[PDB]
Every structure is written in structure tokens, then in C-alpha cells.
Amino acid sequence: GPSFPEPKVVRSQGGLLSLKLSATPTPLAIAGQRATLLTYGGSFPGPTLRVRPRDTVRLTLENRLPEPTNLHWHGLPISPKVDDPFLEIPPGESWTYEFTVPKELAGTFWYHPHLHGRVAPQLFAGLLGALVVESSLDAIPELREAEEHLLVLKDLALQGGRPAPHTPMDWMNGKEGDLVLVNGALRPTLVAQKATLRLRLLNASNARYYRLALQDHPLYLIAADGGFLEEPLEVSELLLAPGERAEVLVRLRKEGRFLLQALPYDRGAMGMMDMGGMAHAMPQGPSRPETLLYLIAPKNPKPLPLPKALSPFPTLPAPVVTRRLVLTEDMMAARFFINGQVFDHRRVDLKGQAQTVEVWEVENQGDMDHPFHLHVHPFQVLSVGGRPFPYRAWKDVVNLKAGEVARLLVPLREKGRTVFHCHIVEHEDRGMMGVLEVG
Amino acid sequence: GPSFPEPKVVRSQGGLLSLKLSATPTPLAIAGQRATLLTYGGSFPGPTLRVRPRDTVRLTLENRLPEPTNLHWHGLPISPKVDDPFLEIPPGESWTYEFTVPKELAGTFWYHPHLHGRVAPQLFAGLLGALVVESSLDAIPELREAEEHLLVLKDLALQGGRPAPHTPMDWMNGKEGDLVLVNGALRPTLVAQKATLRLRLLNASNARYYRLALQDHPLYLIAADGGFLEEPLEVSELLLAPGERAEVLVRLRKEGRFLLQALPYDRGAMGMMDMGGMAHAMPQGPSRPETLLYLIAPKNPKPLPLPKALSPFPTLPAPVVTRRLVLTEDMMAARFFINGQVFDHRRVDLKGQAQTVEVWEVENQGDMDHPFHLHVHPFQVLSVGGRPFPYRAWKDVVNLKAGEVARLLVPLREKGRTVFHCHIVEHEDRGMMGVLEVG
């Protein structure tokens, strides 16, 4: 096959993507070993769905798991009557999701389960895939002539040929695995044929962070979770928290081998120590550095010029309400809260008005990073930790380090009941989620 | 008695105003004729209660009417558990209102009934009195040495020695009467002894407006409904809508007689005409000019200088929500609405958070003036009709002419359930009222 493994792509045909996927325990080869994972479409990751604005998507999910499951159309501004976080597909049953791709939309999105209390083991076991919305912007020469690849960043641990079970400590921290994979492959080699690469990046891990850095190279950020930036932004490194996506251009500078690494990052995960008083909780410290892939540059690379502009970000109406959402932890109980409460599917926490804009101030009063995800309604991050964001783009997950406040502009789009939650999925399962009703 | 009639004053003693008032049909002399009114304390207007910040008020109201009644402590930022707009005192029963006067408070307030559907006939019949909160600011020489008077502006119509009954047209327009009185007196004479007067003004009419102008003189506005301005504001005239209060300084310029008039004002009241197609509604047009009192200036008047400053207006926290409240009419049905609904005491319309500030945009989409009153939570008028207000002061009633939007800054103070409504009281009785819950 191609030196660089990527998930099989399924494209809409004649404006329709009609597909049946089963969620099924699947024996497969992963990182040189045989394992049984939980997969969509018999693969890990699941197939990449590639669509255009205005396409119809008709996806029938068959549940061949021993427990209920569903799909969250993560990042898509569609109706929560379709992207329904309360829906349960029982074992053996099927459900058809049908929606139209919004007109003003582009980027890398993804699909995975969202059923309170069940997300972490299902996601960890392999139930995820990407969804790419292709834009007329892809046709500009600076993007069209780039070599494009999707990188699904997802770690795994195996025990007895199956995904390792969650320990109590995993429920507290969020589970990370020793197999740090790209598209299900262990440190693949990307032998570039063009001098400019266009990399779509997805963090589909339960809890692992990727402090991305390519040796000897900057990255040019061109899209965040849910759409293009207004112009490329040069960065020396790029942190992707669980649930986040980004697209970058890489301009290969000379011939050679360059490692794409996940540099050390301390997200505040904890262990337990008994030193004679004790036991108490003790910081794990920064993650060990990981090589994600080997990037081989072609001979005498001459990268394309960067596009001068991408997409103008919409001018939003003035906001009509400010919300404050405070995140806290009870680490030893592995319980997590928003404004002092755990999730209850019967309780509406926020009531907002469709087509108005809100300001959400999300404050992390815990000691570990918590990435915050809002379904259905993409937002503009204004600032985090008191620092203005250096670009405008749609996001649906925002990372908060201990103590930080994120200020978000939140246009409310589709009416209905939806959720917001921590995207360290264990924390969501263990209570850090609330309900938003838009009317 | 004194040439200028004013209501008898009852002052707090040793920090306590303890008083029993009965609401009772009372035979009395009014404007040269004998009439039976509904009164507090056996007089029309009721007694003026004069208190200081931090005083305790303990007022027992005995209901000697044939229908239920209560008190609204109009303009006072106290608890709606005391100033309770849903409380009914049955005929023959008594209720004791007890509260502390807030520390940061000054001005002319008033008391009158507030029971949905019953306000207009009770108020019209005479149930009202003033409440003055005296400030340490009263001791500055520019105010202390002024000659002070209260002017309760209230019209009346009599039929068979009793207040005239409401007609259907009265419920549509709000009832106005032909006897245009000051402190229950018909065109009294105020023989000034000082060159500077300090006039506290109260519009206690059901619906009549007073476009105030003193012949040959400007007025210096020094307080609005619920407190002092930051500095005096010179005006050539001053419109007081139903429920509004103001305090002005008058600087008598020369010897002579000067009329204080209510100049013609068109509030959009309607009549009915049959001209051969018809009948349809037709504008009443502006009110006829009325003389309110004769003001006689003393010999060689030398007015005091104006105070350079009064009270700095508090710097308010940034608002956390914007509300839009739209006022509309069905004139032929005499029904009045806020956001398309009539009042229902069981239905909460707005839910806000104590100690936050809200922006309320109140929009009059009717054709007649509607003054808008909010209980419990005094507000700062930012603009009306797109015109910035020329001063900062606390108000609790704001007038809106046809089509105008008023933008208010509304700090939410006491917790509990309260109301907001049109202060053309007939319109409140006929539906133009809503419920605010503060938590």
C-alpha cells in the first residue's frame, strides 16, 4: 500500500452520501499485533467521510455491540434532533441519521459515540472516524497543489489482544495508552512528493494531548476545529487537546528526514504516592516525548507560496447574554462538576435564544487541563487565560489549563436540547457535562 | 391655614415610623365641594411620610373598603416580600408592612394600591400619598435655605358627590378628570417667602400628563423618581408622566405673579367618530392647557446660588443580559400586551440574577404614550427614542412615546417575585404587566 496509511475515504456521489456502518468488535492487525477493537466499517480508524456543503448525508448505524451506542456528529452545526446526545441505539438495532451539510462550512470534523457514562471505553476501543467537508477554497492553487493527508492522532493500550480496561485512576485522569498511533499505525513514514503538505489533524484520543512540533520547521495554521482561519498563522508548535482539529501547511525547507513529535506536555494528570504519611495524590508531570511520524522531504523542495488569505470570519451580532461556567474536580472520587453540579439528562442548565449570540466565560478551577466541548453551536474563542486568541476561526473544543478562563462568542444556531462537556471523555462520563436548551 | 395646602407630614421618631392607616370612604371638602373619596388617613392626598435612610417603617394598613386592597411602596428598593404586588388584604382585615429604609436612598416616593384589575378605580378615587426620604444632602446650604414644598399632581372627576365611574373609553385611554388639582386643591396660591424654592413633584394621576412650565422661568432639575441627579440640570419645561416624580429648584427672578402650567400635551388618547363610514377611532389631540398654581414671588428676590454638585451616580458593573420588552395595544378591546401576552400572576416572564445588571430595551409599538414602571429595582435611563438622557439618576418609571425605544440599565437588587407594568394604570389593569423573578 501507500507508505503513509490513511483511512479509506467514502465520498458523496451526486450530492448524496448514503452509507451503512456497523459498530462491531473486529479482529484486525494494529501496530504489528493482532487485536480485537470496536470499529466502524471494520477498520481503525473508521472510514473518512468526505462531503461538500449542501450534500445530503444518510448514515445508517447498526449496533453490533453488547451495549447501547449512538453517534455524535462532532463539530457539525446541525440539529440536535439529528445529532442527538440522548439517543440510545440498543444492541442489534439500527438508526438512520439524515442531515444536509450546512452551506457555510469547511474543515475536518469527526464522528464517535456520545452516551453519558459509556463514551470513554467505546472511544478508547476504537469507535471513531473523520468527516471532511470540502470547500471551494480547496481549489485555490496554494491548497490545490499541496499534498494533502489526514492524521488521526489516537493512542491505545492493549491487554490480552483487546483494549485495556479502565482502572479507577483512568476514570480520574482520562486514559492514555502506550501505543501512540497515527491513523492506527505506529510511527509511519510519510515520503512527501510535494514540497508543500496540507495536513488535516484530529485528536481522537480520550485524554492524551499532542504538543505538535515538526523538527526544523514551523507549521502554518490554516483551519481550527470547525473552519478556516482568515489568513495563515505561523506557529513553532501546535497543541491539540482531545477533540480538537487543525489543518496546517508544511513548507519543506530542504531534503532530509524530519520527525513530527508530540513534545512533553503536562496536563496535570495525577498518580498516588505513599511516602510515609500519605497516600496522597502526586503530579505525573509532563508526558514523555513521542515520535508520531517520520517525514521524508523530496529532492530540492520548493514550497508553494502561502495563500494570502483564506476565509473572512463572519461579523457577529452583539451578544445578548453572558454565562459563567465553572469547572471543578473531586479527584479522589473521580467526580467532575460544572457550577457545582454533575450532569443530569433531565435537568436543563442553560436556556438560550436561537439566532442570538452569547458570551460564555468558562473557568477551570481544577488543577488539570479540561478541554471544553459544546455540541451543535460552533464558537469563536476570544481569549484564554487572559490572552487574546491570535486568529478568528470556528472552534467547538477549547482547552483550559488550571485556573484559566476562556471567553467564547457563541452564536446559537439550531433549536433543541443539546449538551456541553469536558472532552477528556472520562470526565464527561464522570459528571462534567450540562444541558443547553435553545428555543 | 397656610395659603399653600400640602398634606400633613408624619415623621419617623427615634428612627421609627410606626403608623396605622385605614383605607376608607371619607366624606370631605374638595375644590369647594363635598365629596366622598377613598382615602388613607382620612385625607386626600394621604399623609406624607417623611423618613431617613436606616429608619424602620412599620405601617399597618386596615382595609375599610368593600373590596381587597394593598400597598405598593412605589419607587422603594426594598424586598418584594414586603412590597408584595400579589398580596390581597380582604375587606375588614389589616396587614402590617415592615421594612428598613435603604442606606443609599433619597427622594420623593409614594404609596398607592397595586392589585391587578383594581388599581385604576382605587387610585382615581383618592388612594395615594407621598413618602419622602430625607438625605444628608438636604443640609447643604443651597438646599437647606430653599423654601421646600411638595406638589402632588392628581386630577379628579366627580359625579353625584363621588369619583366618576370608569367608562369603556376610560379603560382604553386611562381616565382623566376635569378637576386638575395640586395637593387636592384647585389652583392654590403659593406665596413664596424665599427667592429659591425646592419643589418635590409627584404625578399621582391615573393617566394625565403634566408638561410643566413656570411662566418666565426655567426649572432646575435636581432629582428624578428615585434619587438626585449628579448636578442640577436647567430645563425650560419638564414632562411628568403618571407615576413619575421630580424635584426642581426655582430661582424667582423678579417680583410678580407667575403661573405654573401644564402645557398642551398629546399622549395619544383616542375618541370615537362616526362621519358616515365609521365609527372609528380618532385622536383626541393635545390636552387643554391647565393652570396648576399661582406663584407669587417675594419682594426683590435674590435666589441662592445653585449647588455645584448633588450626588455622584454609582458606577455600575457591566451588564450580563439584554432583554427586549415590546408594548402593543388592541384599542377597541381595551387590551394591552407585553411581548404579545397579557399579565398572568402564575407565569414568570423574566428570570434574573440578584446583584447583576441587565439592559432592558422597552419598545412602544403602540400609538399612545405608555409609561413603564418596574417595581423593586430602580434603573438608569440610558436613552429614549435614540436620544441619550442628559443626566444620570435613579428612575422607576420611564415614558415612551409611540414608536420609541427606551434603553435602561437595571441592577437587580432584592430577590423574589415582582412585576413591571404600564403606569397608565388602566393599561396595567387591562393586561400590560409581566412578572420578573430575581434569584
PDB file of C-alpha atoms in Angstrom, chain B residues 93-254:
ATOM      1  CA  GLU B  93     -58.658  42.913  57.502  1.00  0.00           C
ATOM      2  CA  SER B  94     -55.294  44.525  58.283  1.00  0.00           C
ATOM      3  CA  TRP B  95     -51.710  43.901  57.221  1.00  0.00           C
ATOM      4  CA  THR B  96     -48.501  45.296  58.680  1.00  0.00           C
ATOM      5  CA  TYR B  97     -45.739  46.342  56.321  1.00  0.00           C
ATOM      6  CA  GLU B  98     -42.331  46.471  57.997  1.00  0.00           C
ATOM      7  CA  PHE B  99     -39.062  47.378  56.315  1.00  0.00           C
ATOM      8  CA  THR B 100     -35.864  49.351  56.791  1.00  0.00           C
ATOM      9  CA  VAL B 101     -35.217  52.379  54.594  1.00  0.00           C
ATOM     10  CA  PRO B 102     -32.152  51.607  52.433  1.00  0.00           C
ATOM     11  CA  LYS B 103     -28.959  53.453  53.341  1.00  0.00           C
ATOM     12  CA  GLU B 104     -28.192  54.868  49.911  1.00  0.00           C
ATOM     13  CA  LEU B 105     -31.505  56.491  49.114  1.00  0.00           C
ATOM     14  CA  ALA B 106     -33.072  59.907  48.779  1.00  0.00           C
ATOM     15  CA  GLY B 107     -36.023  61.484  47.067  1.00  0.00           C
ATOM     16  CA  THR B 108     -39.790  61.618  46.675  1.00  0.00           C
ATOM     17  CA  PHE B 109     -41.554  58.256  46.534  1.00  0.00           C
ATOM     18  CA  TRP B 110     -45.179  57.358  47.081  1.00  0.00           C
ATOM     19  CA  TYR B 111     -47.667  54.742  48.170  1.00  0.00           C
ATOM     20  CA  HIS B 112     -50.833  53.502  46.462  1.00  0.00           C
ATOM     21  CA  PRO B 113     -52.671  50.239  45.703  1.00  0.00           C
ATOM     22  CA  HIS B 114     -51.373  47.534  43.406  1.00  0.00           C
ATOM     23  CA  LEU B 115     -53.869  44.758  42.792  1.00  0.00           C
ATOM     24  CA  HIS B 116     -54.281  43.706  39.184  1.00  0.00           C
ATOM     25  CA  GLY B 117     -57.617  44.850  37.781  1.00  0.00           C
ATOM     26  CA  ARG B 118     -58.415  47.106  40.747  1.00  0.00           C
ATOM     27  CA  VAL B 119     -55.747  49.807  40.579  1.00  0.00           C
ATOM     28  CA  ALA B 120     -57.438  52.348  38.323  1.00  0.00           C
ATOM     29  CA  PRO B 121     -60.662  52.892  40.263  1.00  0.00           C
ATOM     30  CA  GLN B 122     -58.914  52.811  43.657  1.00  0.00           C
ATOM     31  CA  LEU B 123     -56.175  55.241  42.669  1.00  0.00           C
ATOM     32  CA  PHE B 124     -58.639  57.513  40.882  1.00  0.00           C
ATOM     33  CA  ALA B 125     -60.872  57.631  43.949  1.00  0.00           C
ATOM     34  CA  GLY B 126     -58.067  59.060  46.079  1.00  0.00           C
ATOM     35  CA  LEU B 127     -55.883  56.278  47.464  1.00  0.00           C
ATOM     36  CA  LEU B 128     -52.372  57.752  47.320  1.00  0.00           C
ATOM     37  CA  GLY B 129     -49.836  59.586  49.445  1.00  0.00           C
ATOM     38  CA  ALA B 130     -46.209  60.669  49.300  1.00  0.00           C
ATOM     39  CA  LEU B 131     -43.143  59.283  51.064  1.00  0.00           C
ATOM     40  CA  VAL B 132     -40.062  61.495  51.324  1.00  0.00           C
ATOM     41  CA  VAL B 133     -36.621  60.130  52.151  1.00  0.00           C
ATOM     42  CA  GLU B 134     -34.538  62.935  53.649  1.00  0.00           C
ATOM     43  CA  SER B 135     -30.758  62.944  52.814  1.00  0.00           C
ATOM     44  CA  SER B 136     -27.692  64.412  54.480  1.00  0.00           C
ATOM     45  CA  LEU B 137     -27.558  66.310  51.179  1.00  0.00           C
ATOM     46  CA  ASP B 138     -30.569  68.337  52.326  1.00  0.00           C
ATOM     47  CA  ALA B 139     -28.211  70.057  54.753  1.00  0.00           C
ATOM     48  CA  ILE B 140     -26.055  71.752  52.113  1.00  0.00           C
ATOM     49  CA  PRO B 141     -26.833  75.492  52.269  1.00  0.00           C
ATOM     50  CA  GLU B 142     -28.154  75.673  48.710  1.00  0.00           C
ATOM     51  CA  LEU B 143     -30.940  73.252  49.628  1.00  0.00           C
ATOM     52  CA  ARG B 144     -31.320  73.892  53.362  1.00  0.00           C
ATOM     53  CA  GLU B 145     -32.079  77.582  52.804  1.00  0.00           C
ATOM     54  CA  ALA B 146     -34.545  76.970  49.965  1.00  0.00           C
ATOM     55  CA  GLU B 147     -38.261  77.043  50.674  1.00  0.00           C
ATOM     56  CA  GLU B 148     -39.467  73.459  50.229  1.00  0.00           C
ATOM     57  CA  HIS B 149     -42.905  72.267  49.113  1.00  0.00           C
ATOM     58  CA  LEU B 150     -44.457  69.033  47.899  1.00  0.00           C
ATOM     59  CA  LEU B 151     -46.784  69.217  44.885  1.00  0.00           C
ATOM     60  CA  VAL B 152     -48.968  66.143  44.426  1.00  0.00           C
ATOM     61  CA  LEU B 153     -50.381  66.416  40.894  1.00  0.00           C
ATOM     62  CA  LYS B 154     -53.643  64.469  40.652  1.00  0.00           C
ATOM     63  CA  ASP B 155     -56.816  65.099  38.658  1.00  0.00           C
ATOM     64  CA  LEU B 156     -60.330  64.032  39.504  1.00  0.00           C
ATOM     65  CA  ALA B 157     -63.865  63.936  38.121  1.00  0.00           C
ATOM     66  CA  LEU B 158     -66.911  63.848  40.382  1.00  0.00           C
ATOM     67  CA  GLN B 159     -70.405  62.542  39.702  1.00  0.00           C
ATOM     68  CA  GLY B 160     -73.071  62.602  42.390  1.00  0.00           C
ATOM     69  CA  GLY B 161     -70.533  63.560  45.057  1.00  0.00           C
ATOM     70  CA  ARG B 162     -68.306  60.560  44.321  1.00  0.00           C
ATOM     71  CA  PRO B 163     -65.457  59.825  41.956  1.00  0.00           C
ATOM     72  CA  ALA B 164     -66.841  59.361  38.461  1.00  0.00           C
ATOM     73  CA  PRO B 165     -67.083  55.718  37.371  1.00  0.00           C
ATOM     74  CA  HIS B 166     -64.869  54.317  34.611  1.00  0.00           C
ATOM     75  CA  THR B 167     -66.387  54.126  31.145  1.00  0.00           C
ATOM     76  CA  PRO B 168     -65.212  51.702  28.489  1.00  0.00           C
ATOM     77  CA  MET B 169     -63.349  54.574  26.849  1.00  0.00           C
ATOM     78  CA  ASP B 170     -61.627  55.216  30.220  1.00  0.00           C
ATOM     79  CA  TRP B 171     -60.276  51.648  30.243  1.00  0.00           C
ATOM     80  CA  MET B 172     -58.859  52.198  26.763  1.00  0.00           C
ATOM     81  CA  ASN B 173     -57.292  55.621  27.354  1.00  0.00           C
ATOM     82  CA  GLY B 174     -56.740  55.835  31.066  1.00  0.00           C
ATOM     83  CA  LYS B 175     -59.140  58.132  32.919  1.00  0.00           C
ATOM     84  CA  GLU B 176     -58.518  61.883  33.174  1.00  0.00           C
ATOM     85  CA  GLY B 177     -60.694  64.296  35.136  1.00  0.00           C
ATOM     86  CA  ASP B 178     -61.695  67.922  34.753  1.00  0.00           C
ATOM     87  CA  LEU B 179     -60.575  68.935  38.255  1.00  0.00           C
ATOM     88  CA  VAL B 180     -56.842  69.385  37.811  1.00  0.00           C
ATOM     89  CA  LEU B 181     -55.618  69.627  41.367  1.00  0.00           C
ATOM     90  CA  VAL B 182     -52.464  70.258  43.367  1.00  0.00           C
ATOM     91  CA  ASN B 183     -52.471  68.565  46.756  1.00  0.00           C
ATOM     92  CA  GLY B 184     -56.242  68.180  46.390  1.00  0.00           C
ATOM     93  CA  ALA B 185     -56.662  71.945  45.968  1.00  0.00           C
ATOM     94  CA  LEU B 186     -57.926  73.780  42.897  1.00  0.00           C
ATOM     95  CA  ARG B 187     -55.292  76.222  41.598  1.00  0.00           C
ATOM     96  CA  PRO B 188     -53.811  77.115  45.009  1.00  0.00           C
ATOM     97  CA  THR B 189     -51.664  80.215  45.540  1.00  0.00           C
ATOM     98  CA  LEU B 190     -48.063  79.746  46.685  1.00  0.00           C
ATOM     99  CA  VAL B 191     -46.881  82.996  48.248  1.00  0.00           C
ATOM    100  CA  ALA B 192     -43.138  82.451  48.308  1.00  0.00           C
ATOM    101  CA  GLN B 193     -41.157  83.832  51.239  1.00  0.00           C
ATOM    102  CA  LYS B 194     -37.777  82.810  49.857  1.00  0.00           C
ATOM    103  CA  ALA B 195     -36.356  83.500  46.405  1.00  0.00           C
ATOM    104  CA  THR B 196     -35.328  79.871  45.888  1.00  0.00           C
ATOM    105  CA  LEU B 197     -37.983  77.164  46.067  1.00  0.00           C
ATOM    106  CA  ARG B 198     -37.314  73.430  46.269  1.00  0.00           C
ATOM    107  CA  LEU B 199     -40.364  71.694  44.807  1.00  0.00           C
ATOM    108  CA  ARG B 200     -40.925  67.959  45.141  1.00  0.00           C
ATOM    109  CA  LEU B 201     -43.259  66.869  42.331  1.00  0.00           C
ATOM    110  CA  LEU B 202     -45.385  63.754  42.127  1.00  0.00           C
ATOM    111  CA  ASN B 203     -47.650  62.708  39.291  1.00  0.00           C
ATOM    112  CA  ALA B 204     -50.217  60.561  41.090  1.00  0.00           C
ATOM    113  CA  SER B 205     -52.771  60.745  38.279  1.00  0.00           C
ATOM    114  CA  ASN B 206     -54.135  57.621  36.564  1.00  0.00           C
ATOM    115  CA  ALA B 207     -53.288  58.868  33.085  1.00  0.00           C
ATOM    116  CA  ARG B 208     -52.940  62.645  32.883  1.00  0.00           C
ATOM    117  CA  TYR B 209     -49.562  64.063  31.900  1.00  0.00           C
ATOM    118  CA  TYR B 210     -48.146  67.333  33.196  1.00  0.00           C
ATOM    119  CA  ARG B 211     -45.981  69.248  30.738  1.00  0.00           C
ATOM    120  CA  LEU B 212     -44.736  71.575  33.448  1.00  0.00           C
ATOM    121  CA  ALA B 213     -43.654  75.133  32.749  1.00  0.00           C
ATOM    122  CA  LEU B 214     -43.416  78.102  35.089  1.00  0.00           C
ATOM    123  CA  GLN B 215     -44.061  81.411  33.339  1.00  0.00           C
ATOM    124  CA  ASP B 216     -40.928  83.396  32.650  1.00  0.00           C
ATOM    125  CA  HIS B 217     -38.711  80.877  34.467  1.00  0.00           C
ATOM    126  CA  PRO B 218     -36.598  77.807  33.766  1.00  0.00           C
ATOM    127  CA  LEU B 219     -36.662  74.878  36.208  1.00  0.00           C
ATOM    128  CA  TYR B 220     -33.528  73.331  37.692  1.00  0.00           C
ATOM    129  CA  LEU B 221     -33.957  69.574  37.874  1.00  0.00           C
ATOM    130  CA  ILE B 222     -32.143  68.110  40.897  1.00  0.00           C
ATOM    131  CA  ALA B 223     -33.771  64.703  41.376  1.00  0.00           C
ATOM    132  CA  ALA B 224     -35.669  62.173  39.272  1.00  0.00           C
ATOM    133  CA  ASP B 225     -38.045  59.480  40.529  1.00  0.00           C
ATOM    134  CA  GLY B 226     -35.659  57.715  42.835  1.00  0.00           C
ATOM    135  CA  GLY B 227     -32.736  59.941  43.638  1.00  0.00           C
ATOM    136  CA  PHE B 228     -30.633  63.008  42.989  1.00  0.00           C
ATOM    137  CA  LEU B 229     -29.006  63.942  39.708  1.00  0.00           C
ATOM    138  CA  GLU B 230     -25.215  64.425  39.766  1.00  0.00           C
ATOM    139  CA  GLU B 231     -25.617  68.169  39.256  1.00  0.00           C
ATOM    140  CA  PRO B 232     -28.560  70.487  38.577  1.00  0.00           C
ATOM    141  CA  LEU B 233     -29.945  70.463  35.025  1.00  0.00           C
ATOM    142  CA  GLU B 234     -31.610  73.572  33.602  1.00  0.00           C
ATOM    143  CA  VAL B 235     -34.789  72.850  31.626  1.00  0.00           C
ATOM    144  CA  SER B 236     -37.389  75.118  30.066  1.00  0.00           C
ATOM    145  CA  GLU B 237     -40.129  72.608  30.774  1.00  0.00           C
ATOM    146  CA  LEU B 238     -40.499  69.238  32.449  1.00  0.00           C
ATOM    147  CA  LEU B 239     -42.867  66.434  31.430  1.00  0.00           C
ATOM    148  CA  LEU B 240     -44.087  64.225  34.278  1.00  0.00           C
ATOM    149  CA  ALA B 241     -45.880  61.083  33.196  1.00  0.00           C
ATOM    150  CA  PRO B 242     -48.129  59.080  35.529  1.00  0.00           C
ATOM    151  CA  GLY B 243     -46.041  57.634  38.359  1.00  0.00           C
ATOM    152  CA  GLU B 244     -43.018  59.867  37.824  1.00  0.00           C
ATOM    153  CA  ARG B 245     -41.505  62.191  40.404  1.00  0.00           C
ATOM    154  CA  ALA B 246     -39.011  65.010  40.136  1.00  0.00           C
ATOM    155  CA  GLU B 247     -37.503  67.675  42.361  1.00  0.00           C
ATOM    156  CA  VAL B 248     -36.663  71.098  40.963  1.00  0.00           C
ATOM    157  CA  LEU B 249     -35.173  74.320  42.207  1.00  0.00           C
ATOM    158  CA  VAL B 250     -36.972  77.504  41.165  1.00  0.00           C
ATOM    159  CA  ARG B 251     -34.964  80.734  41.250  1.00  0.00           C
ATOM    160  CA  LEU B 252     -37.501  83.556  41.361  1.00  0.00           C
ATOM    161  CA  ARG B 253     -36.264  86.307  39.081  1.00  0.00           C
ATOM    162  CA  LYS B 254     -38.403  89.310  39.961  1.00  0.00           C
TER     163      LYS B 254
END
